[PDB]
Design a protein around this ligand. Structure first.
Ligand SMILES: Nc1nc2c(ncn2[C@@H]2O[C@H](COP(=O)(O)OP(=O)(O)O)[C@@H](O)[C@H]2O)c(=O)[nH]1
Ligand code: ALF
Ligand SMILES: [Mg+2]
Ligand SMILES: [Mg+2]
Ligand SMILES: [Mg+2]
Lengths: 176, 133, 132
């Protein structure tokens, strides 16, 4: 039994950093190899991919976050079972957050899906930034009605990373 | 979705095995468009494959991007693809709307047969994919 | 890679000639990040599909097919010809940092497509490298 999880969000929000922390802590035996199609500055170009055990297999993907890469970002959303939306905490990236969530809903509507149709967890990432915004302000922009779990994170340090993944796993399972 | 078990699983595997023999390919996979390995077989003469989940996610995203290019141009589809290196190649074709046949072959395999039995294997697997919808 | 001035003018002429010699609709030089560095449309052809989209998809495809090649121990695969009922696409490397793409229809002869696309790519590879 196979599930696909897509880490979505604006450019540089920390989507790849999530899969890399996860990859570094999951033991050999319970993961496959991480694949990344990235430019030399290591920004993601097409996707990251990380297969793991939690029979049931979870295939974790990230999407490139640049606004002008929507065509490849939407291929990655095909058949998604659950989504982790990685929101950036930086003050100057708040509207980028909203644009990504709007873009997410639009891409999902091309497959005939609404945001109710797919489990979604908001991760508010980069809590370590000195000027970080309140969690609730970030959340009120990407999830005005608070319909979605929210979790805080510092992906470069692991904080929130596995708890975000268990949360979305939980929802994808409860969905069957 | 497409969940493959039971008799259809067994029939898919028998197709993959027969295709390996008829073509001389190293590896045969049925993958879904989402990137999941649904059945795989390896020719017993051949070395260990590269990680098959890597192979299958790369192949599914190649197919995703090329199908999107087709649709961009007003086409339902391009044809089966043969990727050809100096020694190694890949034959990738549709097994119905939800899956792909993948053949990995080397210099020892005759390309005519790869294409020819690859295409019949695709068609047999689409038939099997339907009975697992 | 950024093409401006005389290398850009040089690129555009290679693109115009390939269209003339092939009967193709549109011709682009794109970088491996999917940005269009130069392009030309045939005067007779319809308005193209969105070319920024076409280019992000070709470069995504290329990164994936390049990873497949390396996975199998290959430097690379060959140039691609994708053929629908009427429309088609030719893609080939133009040096290490760029791809030439031609979009064509059933009036463009495939042998010319292949023969001039390949020459266009080598010509553009030369323009690209000498631009550095
Ligand atoms: N300060 C801080 N930086 C982070 C955090 N998460 C990721 N980064 C950095 O943000 C940059 C982009 O990360 P990456 O995952 O590549 O972004 P993305 O894949 O485009 O979403 C990298 O330099 C990461 O080290 C975090 O929680 N805090
Ligand atoms: F660098 Al990104 F998504 F913006 F991988
Ligand atoms: Mg990334
Ligand atoms: Mg809005
Ligand atoms: Mg023009």
């Amino acid at each position: 039994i196979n599930f696909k999880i897509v880490y979505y969000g604006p450019g540089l929000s920390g989507k790849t950093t999530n899969l890399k922390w996860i990859y570094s802590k999951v033991p050999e035996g319970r993961k496959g190899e991480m694949v990344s199609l990235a430019t030399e500055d290591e920004r993601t170009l097409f996707f990251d991919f990380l297969p793991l055990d939690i029979k049931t297999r979870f295939h974790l993907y990230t999407v490139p976050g640049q606004v002008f890469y929507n065509a490849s970002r939407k291929l990655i959303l095909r058949g998604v079972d659950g989504i982790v939306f990685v929101a950036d905490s930086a003050p100057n990236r708040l509207r980028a957050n909203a644009e990504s969530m709007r873009n997410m809903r639009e891409n999902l509507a091309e497959y005939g899906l609404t945001l109710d149709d797919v489990p979604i967890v908001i991760q508010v990432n980069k809590r370590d930034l000195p000027d970080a915004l309140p969690v609730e302000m970030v959340r009120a922009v990407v999830d005005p009605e608070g319909k979605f779990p929210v979790l805080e994170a510092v992906a470069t340090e692991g904080k929130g990373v596995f708890e975000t993944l268990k949360e979305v796993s939980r929802l994808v399972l409860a969905r069957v | 979705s497409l969940v493959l078990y039971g008799a259809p699983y067994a029939a898919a595997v028998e197709v993959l095995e027969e295709t390996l023999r008829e073509t001389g390919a190293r590896y045969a996979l049925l993958i879904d468009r989402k990137g999941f390995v649904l059945a795989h077989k390896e020719a017993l003469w051949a070395p260990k494959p590269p990680p098959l989940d890597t192979l299958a996610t790369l192949v599914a995203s190649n197919a995703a991007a090329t199908q999107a290019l087709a649709k961009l141009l007003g086409e339902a589809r391009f044809q089966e693809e043969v990727h050809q290196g100096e020694r190694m190649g890949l034959y990738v074709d549709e097994a119905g709307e939800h899956a792909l046949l993948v053949l990995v072959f080397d210099e020892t395999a005759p390309l005519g047969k790869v294409k020819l039995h690859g295409k019949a294997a695709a068609a047999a697997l689409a038939a099997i994919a339907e009975e697992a919808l």
